[PDB]
Design goal:
This is part of a larger assembly, with 3 copies of chain A.
Chain A lengths: L4 H4 L5 H9 L6 H10 L8 H4 L1 H4 L6 H8 L6 H6 L9 H13 L6 H7 L5 H10 L8 H8 L2 H11 L8
């Protein structure tokens, strides 16, 4: 049981800690991250994200993000995926980034990647947008025009409410 | 009659629970701290 | 029958109270902030 840095993290320099966790990680960093998440205090929460974005370039396994999202994950997953949307072509990554941006309000950063990225299915995206009502949602009037799906957007707006959406 | 009064009190407690759910739904607004992006 | 429905709502409220008890059990984990030693 050499994994005991969860208590020493509050005193050791995070730089050399990340450097030690990046190297010599022969299927070992996963257990260390699981042990860190087992005692994920608010103080040592961001360090679990800092170490997480070093090994993804070599092996971006889904088990890690699945175990991470099992907790609350207010903005840790969003801050992690903020540097993963670029240099990536997977639609599920973008969908999980949209979910994280819907967990805590950062929707102003989603309307840009909807125009930039074009390697995702807009059907599930607009379904999730219509499901999670932001009560101030206007990325839809952008993605629908980008993918030419305003014929149902106008109907949905007229159904829910029509105050400023079509105007703006 | 007293049990119906207690049911009304339980409905008031459910309204308080709905208020707590609204507070939880508003919590993501406070969760969006700009200092967490550093 | 409506009173039995209210009893089911009370059981849901008890499940919410169990969730609150779990939150209270997790509270000492958040209470252990290492930044309090400064």
């Amino acid at each position: 049981d050499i994994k005991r840095a969860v208590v020493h993290t509050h005193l050791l320099n995070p730089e050399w800690l990340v450097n030690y966790f990046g190297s010599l990680s022969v299927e070992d960093s996963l257990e260390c991250l699981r042990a860190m998440l087992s005692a994920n205090i608010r103080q040592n929460l961001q360090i679990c994200v800092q170490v997480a974005s070093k090994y993804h370039e070599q092996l971006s396994t889904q088990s890690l993000i699945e175990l991470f999202e099992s907790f609350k994950s207010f903005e840790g997953l969003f801050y992690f995926l903020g540097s993963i949307v670029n240099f990536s072509q997977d639609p599920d990554v973008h969908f999980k980034y949209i979910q994280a941006a819907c967990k805590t309000g950062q929707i102003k950063e989603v309307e840009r990647i909807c125009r930039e990225s074009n390697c995702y299915d807009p059907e599930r995206v607009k379904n999730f947008l219509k499901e999670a009502k932001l009560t101030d949602q206007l990325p839809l009037i952008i993605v629908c025009d980008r993918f030419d799906f305003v014929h149902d957007l106008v109907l949905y707006l007229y159904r829910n409410n029509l105050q400023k959406y079509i105007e703006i | 009659k007293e049990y119906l009064t207690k049911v009304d009190k339980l409905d008031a407690s459910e309204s308080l629970r709905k208020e707590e759910e609204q507070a939880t739904e508003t919590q993501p607004i406070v969760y969006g701290q700009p200092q967490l992006m550093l």
